[PDB]
């Protein structure tokens, strides 16, 4: 079952087997294939000026309680992933979720990544590195003003966890970032998803995610 962008829909968003799935592009176009459960494969043709492409596919929280309230949260994945043109582009493999602040006081909006591998470009900032899972990120967060998932241009924050060895396989203790962002002081709304993301900036590639498992205990 495939999904294709850029040819007269720039969008398609949906579920299927419990997992959501999304995929959208602005100047560029692209396709998902989904497999079982929240598997799927995505290729995209965005090596043009301002191309973007994203592909994602997680687990809906509903935005019901605080991220670091559940006890544990788990992904595990196994993907191939490539880019093949750049135009002076770039993209990441992550995951990908927000913290929604409706109702909550004194708490930000947050977009997250975790990124687990990038070409060519990944953001950074002054930031702090920490172990998860026996390996290396830098953490730090920044503003962003931009299109949100409650409507029109905000200004609201992205948390960041960058892996500093890239992989496309493993297992991400997805509730340890979490705490980690909440250790700085961050603030930490309600958790939204947690997805496996794939995006791309004046970029073609492709990814093939091949196992993905999102769970809560």
Same mark, same amino acid.
């Given at each position: 079952?495939?999904?294709?962008?850029?040819?007269?829909?720039?969008?398609?968003?949906?579920?299927?087997?419990?997992?959501?799935?999304?995929?959208?592009?602005?100047?560029?176009?692209?396709?998902?294939?989904?497999?079982?459960?929240? =598997?799927?494969? #995505?290729?995209? +043709?965005?090596?043009?000026?301002?191309?973007?492409?994203?592909?994602? !596919? /997680? @687990?809906?929280?509903?935005?019901?309680?605080?991220?670091?309230?559940?006890?544990?949260?788990?992904?595990?994945?196994?993907?191939?992933?490539?880019? =093949?043109?750049? #135009?002076?582009? +770039?993209?990441?493999?992550?995951?990908?979720?927000?913290?929604?602040? !409706? /109702? @909550?006081?004194?708490?930000?909006?947050?977009?997250?990544?975790?990124?687990?591998?990038?070409?060519?470009?990944?953001?950074?900032?002054?930031?702090?590195?920490?172990?998860?899972?026996?390996?290396?990120?830098?953490?730090?967060?920044?503003?962003?003003?931009?299109?949100?998932?409650?409507?029109?241009?905000?200004?609201?924050?992205?948390?960041?966890?960058?892996?500093?060895?890239?992989?496309?396989?493993?297992?991400?203790?997805?509730?340890?970032?979490?705490?980690?962002?909440?250790?700085?002081?961050?603030?930490?709304?309600?958790?939204?998803?947690?997805?496996?993301?794939?995006?791309?900036?004046?970029?073609?590639?492709?990814?093939?995610?091949?196992?993905?498992?999102?769970?809560?205990?």
């Amino acid at each position: 079952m495939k999904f294709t962008v850029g040819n007269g829909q720039n969008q398609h968003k949906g579920v299927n087997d419990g997992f959501s799935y999304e995929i959208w592009t602005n100047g560029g176009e692209g396709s998902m294939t989904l497999g079982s459960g929240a =598997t799927f494969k #995505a290729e995209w +043709n965005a090596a043009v000026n301002r191309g973007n492409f994203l592909a994602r !596919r /997680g @687990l809906d929280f509903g935005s019901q309680k605080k991220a670091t309230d559940y006890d544990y949260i788990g992904l595990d994945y196994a993907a191939t992933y490539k880019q =093949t043109a750049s #135009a002076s582009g +770039n993209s990441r493999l992550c995951v990908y979720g927000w913290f929604q602040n !409706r /109702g @909550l006081n004194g708490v930000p909006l947050v977009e997250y990544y975790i990124i687990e591998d990038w070409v060519d470009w990944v953001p950074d900032a002054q930031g702090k590195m920490v172990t998860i899972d026996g390996a290396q990120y830098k953490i730090f967060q920044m503003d962003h003003t931009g299109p949100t998932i409650n409507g029109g241009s905000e200004t609201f924050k992205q948390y960041f966890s960058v892996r500093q060895q890239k992989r496309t396989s493993g297992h991400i203790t997805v509730s340890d970032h979490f705490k980690e962002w909440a250790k700085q002081g961050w603030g930490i709304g309600n958790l939204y998803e947690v997805a496996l993301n794939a995006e791309g900036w004046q970029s073609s590639g492709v990814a093939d995610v091949t196992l993905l498992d999102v769970y809560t205990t």
